[PDB]
Short mmCIF file of C-alpha atoms (C1' of nucleotides) and ligand atoms in Angstrom, two decimals:
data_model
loop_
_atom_site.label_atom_id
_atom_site.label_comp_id
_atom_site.label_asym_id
_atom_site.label_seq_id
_atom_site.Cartn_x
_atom_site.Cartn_y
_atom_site.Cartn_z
CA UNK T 5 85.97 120.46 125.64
CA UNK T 6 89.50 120.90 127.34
CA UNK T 7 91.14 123.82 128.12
CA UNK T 8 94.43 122.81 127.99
CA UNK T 9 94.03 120.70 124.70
CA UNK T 10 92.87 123.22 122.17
CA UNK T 11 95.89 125.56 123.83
CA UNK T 12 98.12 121.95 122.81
CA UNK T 13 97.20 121.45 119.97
CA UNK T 14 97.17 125.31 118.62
CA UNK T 15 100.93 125.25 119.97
CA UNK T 16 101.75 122.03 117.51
CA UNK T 17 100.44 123.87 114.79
CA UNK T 18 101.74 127.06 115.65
CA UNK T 19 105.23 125.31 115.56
CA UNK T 20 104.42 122.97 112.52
CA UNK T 21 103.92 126.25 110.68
CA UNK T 22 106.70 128.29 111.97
CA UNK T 23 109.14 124.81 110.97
CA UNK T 24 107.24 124.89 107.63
CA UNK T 25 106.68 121.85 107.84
CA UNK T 26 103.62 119.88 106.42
CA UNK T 27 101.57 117.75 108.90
CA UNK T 28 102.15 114.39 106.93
CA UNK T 29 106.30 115.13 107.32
CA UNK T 30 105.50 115.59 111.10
CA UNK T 31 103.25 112.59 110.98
CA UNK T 32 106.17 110.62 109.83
CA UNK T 33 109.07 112.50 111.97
CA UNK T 34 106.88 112.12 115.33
CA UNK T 35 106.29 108.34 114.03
CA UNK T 36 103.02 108.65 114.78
CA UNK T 37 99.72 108.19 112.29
CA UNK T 38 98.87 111.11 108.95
CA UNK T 39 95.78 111.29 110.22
CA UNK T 40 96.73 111.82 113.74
CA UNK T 41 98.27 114.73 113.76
CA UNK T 42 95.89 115.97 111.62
CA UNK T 43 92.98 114.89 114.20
CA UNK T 44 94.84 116.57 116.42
CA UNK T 45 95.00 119.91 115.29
CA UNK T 46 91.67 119.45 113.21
CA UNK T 47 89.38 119.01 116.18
CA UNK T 48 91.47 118.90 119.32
CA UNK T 49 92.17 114.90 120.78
CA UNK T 50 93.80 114.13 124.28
CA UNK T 51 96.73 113.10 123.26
CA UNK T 52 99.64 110.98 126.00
CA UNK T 53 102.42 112.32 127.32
CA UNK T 54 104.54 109.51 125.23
CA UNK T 55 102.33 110.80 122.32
CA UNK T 56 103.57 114.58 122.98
CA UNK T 57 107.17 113.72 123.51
CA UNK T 58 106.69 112.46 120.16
CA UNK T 59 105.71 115.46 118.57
CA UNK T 60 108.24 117.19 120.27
CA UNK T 61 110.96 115.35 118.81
CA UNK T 62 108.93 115.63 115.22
CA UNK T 63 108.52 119.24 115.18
CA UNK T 64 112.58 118.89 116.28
CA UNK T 65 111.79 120.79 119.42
CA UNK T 66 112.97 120.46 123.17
CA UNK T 67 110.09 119.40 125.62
CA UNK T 68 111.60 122.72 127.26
CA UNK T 69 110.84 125.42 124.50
CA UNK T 70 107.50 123.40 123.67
CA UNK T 71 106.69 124.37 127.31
CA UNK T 72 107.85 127.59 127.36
CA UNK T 73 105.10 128.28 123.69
CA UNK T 74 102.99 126.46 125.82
CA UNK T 75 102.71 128.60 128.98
CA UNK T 76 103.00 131.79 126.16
CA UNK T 77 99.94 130.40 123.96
CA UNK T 78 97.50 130.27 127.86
CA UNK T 79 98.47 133.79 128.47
CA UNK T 80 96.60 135.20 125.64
CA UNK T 81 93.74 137.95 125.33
CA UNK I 5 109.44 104.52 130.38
CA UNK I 6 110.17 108.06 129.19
CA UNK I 7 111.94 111.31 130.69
CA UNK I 8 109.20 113.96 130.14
CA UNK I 9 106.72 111.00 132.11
CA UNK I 10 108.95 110.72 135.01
CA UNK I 11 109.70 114.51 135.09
CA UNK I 12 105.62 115.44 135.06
CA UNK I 13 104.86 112.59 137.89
CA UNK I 14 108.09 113.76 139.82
CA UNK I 15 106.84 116.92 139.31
CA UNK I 16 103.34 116.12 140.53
CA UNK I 17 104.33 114.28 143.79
CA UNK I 18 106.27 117.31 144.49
CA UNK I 19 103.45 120.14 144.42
CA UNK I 20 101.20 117.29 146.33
CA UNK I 21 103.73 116.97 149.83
CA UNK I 22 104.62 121.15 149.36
CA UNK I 23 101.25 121.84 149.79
CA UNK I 24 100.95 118.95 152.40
CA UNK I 25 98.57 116.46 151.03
CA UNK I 26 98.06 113.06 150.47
CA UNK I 27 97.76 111.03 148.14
CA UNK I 28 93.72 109.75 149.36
CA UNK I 29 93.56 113.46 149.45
CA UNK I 30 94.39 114.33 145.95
CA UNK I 31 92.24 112.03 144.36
CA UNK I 32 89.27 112.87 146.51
CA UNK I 33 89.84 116.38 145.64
CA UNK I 34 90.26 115.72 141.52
CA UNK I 35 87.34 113.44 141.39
CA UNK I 36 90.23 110.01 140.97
CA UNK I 37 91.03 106.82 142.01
CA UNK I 38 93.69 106.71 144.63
CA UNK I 39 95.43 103.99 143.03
CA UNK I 40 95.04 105.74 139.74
CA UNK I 41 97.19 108.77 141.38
CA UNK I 42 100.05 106.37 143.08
CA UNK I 43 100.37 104.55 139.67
CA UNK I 44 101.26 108.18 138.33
CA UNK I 45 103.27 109.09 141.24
CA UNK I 46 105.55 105.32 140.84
CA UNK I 47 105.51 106.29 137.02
CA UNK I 48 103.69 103.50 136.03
CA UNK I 49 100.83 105.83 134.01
CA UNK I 50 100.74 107.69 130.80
CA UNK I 51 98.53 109.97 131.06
CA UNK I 52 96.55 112.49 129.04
CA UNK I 53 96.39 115.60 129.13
CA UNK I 54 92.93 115.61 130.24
CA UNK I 55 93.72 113.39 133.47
CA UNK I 56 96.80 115.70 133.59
CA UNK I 57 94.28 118.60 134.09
CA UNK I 58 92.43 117.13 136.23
CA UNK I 59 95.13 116.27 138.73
CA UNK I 60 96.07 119.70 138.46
CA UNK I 61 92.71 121.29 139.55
CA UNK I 62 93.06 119.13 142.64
CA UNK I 63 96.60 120.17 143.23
CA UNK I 64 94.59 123.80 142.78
CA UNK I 65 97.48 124.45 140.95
CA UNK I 66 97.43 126.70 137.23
CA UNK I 67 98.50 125.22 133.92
CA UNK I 68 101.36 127.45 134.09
CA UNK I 69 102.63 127.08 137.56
CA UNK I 70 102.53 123.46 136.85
CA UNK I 71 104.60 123.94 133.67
CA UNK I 72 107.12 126.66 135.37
CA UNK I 73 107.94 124.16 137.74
CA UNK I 74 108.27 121.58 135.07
CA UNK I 75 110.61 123.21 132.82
CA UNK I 76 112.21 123.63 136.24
CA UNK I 77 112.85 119.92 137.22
CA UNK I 78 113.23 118.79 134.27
CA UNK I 79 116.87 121.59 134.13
CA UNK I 80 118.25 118.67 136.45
CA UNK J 5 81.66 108.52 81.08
CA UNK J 6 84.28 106.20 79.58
CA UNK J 7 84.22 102.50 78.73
CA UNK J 8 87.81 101.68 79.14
CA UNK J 9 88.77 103.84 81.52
CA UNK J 10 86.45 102.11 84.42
CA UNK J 11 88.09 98.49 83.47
CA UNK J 12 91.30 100.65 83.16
CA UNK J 13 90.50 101.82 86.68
CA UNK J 14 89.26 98.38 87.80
CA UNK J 15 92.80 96.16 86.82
CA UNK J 16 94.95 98.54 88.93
CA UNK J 17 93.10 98.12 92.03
CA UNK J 18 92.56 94.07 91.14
CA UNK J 19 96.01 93.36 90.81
CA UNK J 20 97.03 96.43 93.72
CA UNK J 21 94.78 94.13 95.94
CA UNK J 22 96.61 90.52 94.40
CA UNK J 23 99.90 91.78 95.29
CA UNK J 24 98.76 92.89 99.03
CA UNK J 25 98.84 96.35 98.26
CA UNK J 26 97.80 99.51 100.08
CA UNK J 27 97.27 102.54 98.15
CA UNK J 28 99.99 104.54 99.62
CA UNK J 29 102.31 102.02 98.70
CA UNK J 30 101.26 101.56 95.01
CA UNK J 31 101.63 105.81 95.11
CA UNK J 32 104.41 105.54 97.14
CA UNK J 33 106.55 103.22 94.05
CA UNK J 34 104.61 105.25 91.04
CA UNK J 35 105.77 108.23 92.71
CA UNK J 36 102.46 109.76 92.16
CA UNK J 37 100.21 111.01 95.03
CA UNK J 38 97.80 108.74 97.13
CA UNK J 39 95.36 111.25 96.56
CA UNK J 40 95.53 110.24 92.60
CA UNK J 41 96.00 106.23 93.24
CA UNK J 42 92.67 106.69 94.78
CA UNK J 43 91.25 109.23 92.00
CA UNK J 44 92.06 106.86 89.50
CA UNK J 45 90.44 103.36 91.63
CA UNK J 46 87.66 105.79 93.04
CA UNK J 47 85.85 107.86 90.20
CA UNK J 48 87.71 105.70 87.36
CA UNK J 49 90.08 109.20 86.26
CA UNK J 50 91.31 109.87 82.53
CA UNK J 51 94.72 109.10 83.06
CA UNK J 52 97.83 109.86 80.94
CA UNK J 53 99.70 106.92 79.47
CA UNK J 54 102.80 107.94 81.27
CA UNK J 55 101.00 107.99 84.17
CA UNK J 56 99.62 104.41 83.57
CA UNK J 57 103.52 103.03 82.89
CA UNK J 58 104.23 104.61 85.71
CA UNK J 59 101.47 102.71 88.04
CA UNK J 60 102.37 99.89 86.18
CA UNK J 61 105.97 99.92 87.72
CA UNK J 62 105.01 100.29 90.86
CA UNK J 63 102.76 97.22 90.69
CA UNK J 64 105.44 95.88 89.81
CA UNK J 65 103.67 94.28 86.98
CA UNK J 66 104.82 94.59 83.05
CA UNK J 67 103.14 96.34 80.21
CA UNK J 68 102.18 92.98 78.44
CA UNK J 69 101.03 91.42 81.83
CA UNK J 70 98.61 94.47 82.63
CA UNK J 71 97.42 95.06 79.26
CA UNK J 72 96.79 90.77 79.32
CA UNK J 73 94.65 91.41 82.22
CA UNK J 74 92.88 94.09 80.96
CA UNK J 75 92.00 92.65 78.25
CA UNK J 76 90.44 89.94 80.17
CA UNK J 77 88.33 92.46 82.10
CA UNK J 78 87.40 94.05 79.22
CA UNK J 79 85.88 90.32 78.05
CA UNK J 80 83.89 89.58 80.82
CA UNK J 81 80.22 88.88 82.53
CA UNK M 5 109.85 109.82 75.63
CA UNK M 6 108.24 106.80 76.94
CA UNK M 7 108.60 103.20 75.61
CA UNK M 8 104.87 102.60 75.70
CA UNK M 9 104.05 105.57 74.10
CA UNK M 10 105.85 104.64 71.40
CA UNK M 11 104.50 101.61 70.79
CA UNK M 12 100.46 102.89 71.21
CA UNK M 13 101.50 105.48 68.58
CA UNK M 14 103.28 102.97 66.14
CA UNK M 15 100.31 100.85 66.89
CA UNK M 16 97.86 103.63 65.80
CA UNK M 17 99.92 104.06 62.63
CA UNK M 18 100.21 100.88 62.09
CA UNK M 19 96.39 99.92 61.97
CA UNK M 20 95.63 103.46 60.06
CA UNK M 21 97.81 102.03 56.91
CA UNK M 22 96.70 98.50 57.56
CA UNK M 23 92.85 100.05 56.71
CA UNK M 24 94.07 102.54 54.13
CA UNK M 25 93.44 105.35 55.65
CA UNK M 26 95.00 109.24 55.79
CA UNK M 27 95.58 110.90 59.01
CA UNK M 28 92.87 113.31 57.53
CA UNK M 29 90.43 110.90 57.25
CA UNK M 30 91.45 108.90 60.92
CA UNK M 31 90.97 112.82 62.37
CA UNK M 32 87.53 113.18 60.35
CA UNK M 33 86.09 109.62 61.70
CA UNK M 34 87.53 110.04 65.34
CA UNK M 35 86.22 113.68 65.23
CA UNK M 36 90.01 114.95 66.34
CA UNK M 37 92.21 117.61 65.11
CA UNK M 38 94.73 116.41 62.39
CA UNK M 39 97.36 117.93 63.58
CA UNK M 40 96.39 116.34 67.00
CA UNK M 41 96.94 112.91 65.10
CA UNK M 42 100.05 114.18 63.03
CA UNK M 43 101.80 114.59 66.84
CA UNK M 44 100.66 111.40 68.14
CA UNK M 45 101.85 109.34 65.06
CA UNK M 46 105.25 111.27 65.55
CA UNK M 47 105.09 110.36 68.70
CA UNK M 48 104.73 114.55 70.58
CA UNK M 49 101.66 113.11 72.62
CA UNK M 50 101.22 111.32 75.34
CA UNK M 51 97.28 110.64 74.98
CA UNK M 52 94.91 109.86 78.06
CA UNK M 53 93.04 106.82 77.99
CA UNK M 54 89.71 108.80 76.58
CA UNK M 55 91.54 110.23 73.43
CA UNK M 56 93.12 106.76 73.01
CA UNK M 57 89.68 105.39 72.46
CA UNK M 58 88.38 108.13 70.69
CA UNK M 59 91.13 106.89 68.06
CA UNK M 60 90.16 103.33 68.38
CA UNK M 61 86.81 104.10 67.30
CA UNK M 62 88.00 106.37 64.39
CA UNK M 63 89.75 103.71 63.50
CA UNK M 64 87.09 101.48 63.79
CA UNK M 65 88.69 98.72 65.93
CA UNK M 66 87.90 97.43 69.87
CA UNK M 67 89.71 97.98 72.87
CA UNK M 68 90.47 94.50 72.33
CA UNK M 69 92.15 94.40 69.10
CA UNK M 70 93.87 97.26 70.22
CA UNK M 71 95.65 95.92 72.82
CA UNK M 72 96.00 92.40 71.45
CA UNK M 73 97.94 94.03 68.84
CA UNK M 74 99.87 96.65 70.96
CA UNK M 75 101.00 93.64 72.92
CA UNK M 76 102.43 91.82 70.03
CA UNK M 77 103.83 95.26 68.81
CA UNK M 78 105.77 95.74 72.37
CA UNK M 79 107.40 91.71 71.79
CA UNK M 80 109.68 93.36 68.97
"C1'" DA N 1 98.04 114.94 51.71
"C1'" DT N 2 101.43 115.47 56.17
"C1'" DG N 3 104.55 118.28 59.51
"C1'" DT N 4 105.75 122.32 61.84
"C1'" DG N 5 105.37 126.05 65.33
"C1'" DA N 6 103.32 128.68 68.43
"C1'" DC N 7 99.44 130.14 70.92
"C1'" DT N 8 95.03 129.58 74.26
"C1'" DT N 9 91.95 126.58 77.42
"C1'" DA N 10 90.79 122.71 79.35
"C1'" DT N 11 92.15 119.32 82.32
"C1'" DA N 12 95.64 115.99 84.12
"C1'" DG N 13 98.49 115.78 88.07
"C1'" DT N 14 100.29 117.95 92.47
"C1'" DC N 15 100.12 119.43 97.12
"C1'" DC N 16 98.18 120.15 101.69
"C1'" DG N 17 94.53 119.25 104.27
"C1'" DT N 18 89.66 117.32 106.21
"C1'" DG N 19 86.64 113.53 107.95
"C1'" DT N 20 85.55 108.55 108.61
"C1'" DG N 21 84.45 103.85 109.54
"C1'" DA N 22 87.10 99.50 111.67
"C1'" DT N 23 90.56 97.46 114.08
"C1'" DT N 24 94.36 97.19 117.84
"C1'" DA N 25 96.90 98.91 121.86
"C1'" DT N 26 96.46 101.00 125.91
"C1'" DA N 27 94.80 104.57 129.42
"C1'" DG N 28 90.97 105.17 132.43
"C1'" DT N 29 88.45 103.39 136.42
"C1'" DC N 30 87.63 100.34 139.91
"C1'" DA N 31 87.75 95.57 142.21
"C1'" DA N 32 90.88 92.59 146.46
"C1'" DC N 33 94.42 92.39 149.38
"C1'" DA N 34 99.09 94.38 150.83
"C1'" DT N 35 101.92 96.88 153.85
"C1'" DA H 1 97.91 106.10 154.90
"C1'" DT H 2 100.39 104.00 150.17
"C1'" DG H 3 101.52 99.79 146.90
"C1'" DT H 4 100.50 96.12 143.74
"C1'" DT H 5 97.94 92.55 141.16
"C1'" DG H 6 94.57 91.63 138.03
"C1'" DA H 7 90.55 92.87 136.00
"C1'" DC H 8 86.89 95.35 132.77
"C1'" DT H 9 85.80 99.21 129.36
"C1'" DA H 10 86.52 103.40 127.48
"C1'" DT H 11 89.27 105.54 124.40
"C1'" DA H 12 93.96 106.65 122.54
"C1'" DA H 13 96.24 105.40 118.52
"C1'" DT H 14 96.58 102.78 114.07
"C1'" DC H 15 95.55 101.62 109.29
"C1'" DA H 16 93.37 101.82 104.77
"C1'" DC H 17 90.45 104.96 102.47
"C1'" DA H 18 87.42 108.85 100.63
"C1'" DC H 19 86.92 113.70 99.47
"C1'" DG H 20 87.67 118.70 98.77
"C1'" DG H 21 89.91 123.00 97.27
"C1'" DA H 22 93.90 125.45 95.14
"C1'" DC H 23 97.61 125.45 92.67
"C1'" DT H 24 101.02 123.88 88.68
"C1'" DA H 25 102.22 121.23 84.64
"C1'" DT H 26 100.69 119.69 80.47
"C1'" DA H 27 97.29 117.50 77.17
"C1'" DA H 28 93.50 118.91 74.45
"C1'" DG H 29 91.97 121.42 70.73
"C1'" DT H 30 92.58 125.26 67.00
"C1'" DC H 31 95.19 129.05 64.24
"C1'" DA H 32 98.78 129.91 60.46
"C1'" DC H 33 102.34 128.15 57.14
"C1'" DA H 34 105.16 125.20 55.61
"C1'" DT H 35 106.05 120.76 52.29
MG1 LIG E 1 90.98 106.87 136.75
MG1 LIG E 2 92.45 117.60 70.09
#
DNA sequence: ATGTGACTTATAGTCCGTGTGATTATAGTCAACAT
DNA sequence: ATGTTGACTATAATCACACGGACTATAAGTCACAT
């Protein structure tokens, strides 16, 4: 669907992982929905800005170095 | 209202008057309602990151530009 | 499959239900998983009599009381 | 151990005597392993539901009775 | 008769995730009128 | 030109649940040898 979604949400996981964290700690950490952040690495979903920020604090990251995995993740071939 | 929200709208009102535009302007050329884009641009919209895609294709602007300068503004 | 087991199965989601109960809170205060709170109400599973004290606590119900009401399911049609 | 478990296992002992029966003979009718029944009665098992009913019906007694006597059993 | 121990093998119970209908909050989009 | 106020309607986000696969702990079932 979205370009800039799938690259998103591979960045959340990528970090989840790296954290080792589970998704349903970072479902409670972000204060957000299990299933969400499931849904949104499991298909993509659009998340909100507010919803990101969320994340970001969950994965116990700085909007900054989320960002700066971001802009790596879109350079990739 | 959050920081990162204020930061990406600042940030998107900035790339629209650098590259001379208006406001009319950059919703005709993202396929967006005008008032849609000064909500954004007063901070009063959340947005996705779909309409935040959108707004940058009419910017003609690249993910990662738009993210440099981000991470930029948002280092006070 | 097993006779007592499905009225076994049927009294903890009954009285989970009576006391306003989700599943991940009834799992959350048997400290077992929700995944097996909703084995056991789903495909009526052969659980352990540990495990049953143990969902009995966290219905916050006594072993007479549940047993009293299982009997009663046991009696009915 | 566990309190219940206990109290299922005197129970099962209990109602075994009550009938007259060995724990060779409650293993033959239940078709269960005697030593199976030996550990229970000591109390080193911690049954599932199925194998508690498989015992009920080796000893030749319903859910009900069961239960209606565990109860009493658990009163001291 | 019953009670051990110790030794496989079935399965109970755990852990991490997927996928889904139904409801609630809210973003997406577009009016009218402002300046 | 941009700002603001209501609106309607799409959909983000929530909440309670089902379902699967893989792994770990342990109950199920059977030996040998006590007594
Ligand atoms: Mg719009
Ligand atoms: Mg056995």
């Amino acid at each position: 669907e979205s370009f800039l979604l799938s690259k998103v949400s591979f960045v959340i996981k990528k970090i989840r992982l790296e954290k080792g964290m589970t998704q349903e700690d970072l479902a409670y950490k972000s204060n957000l929905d299990r299933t969400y952040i499931s849904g949104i690495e499991r298909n993509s979903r659009n998340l909100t800005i507010k919803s990101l920020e969320l994340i970001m604090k969950g994965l116990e990251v700085s909007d900054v170095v989320f960002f700066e995995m971001l802009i790596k993740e879109i350079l990739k071939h």
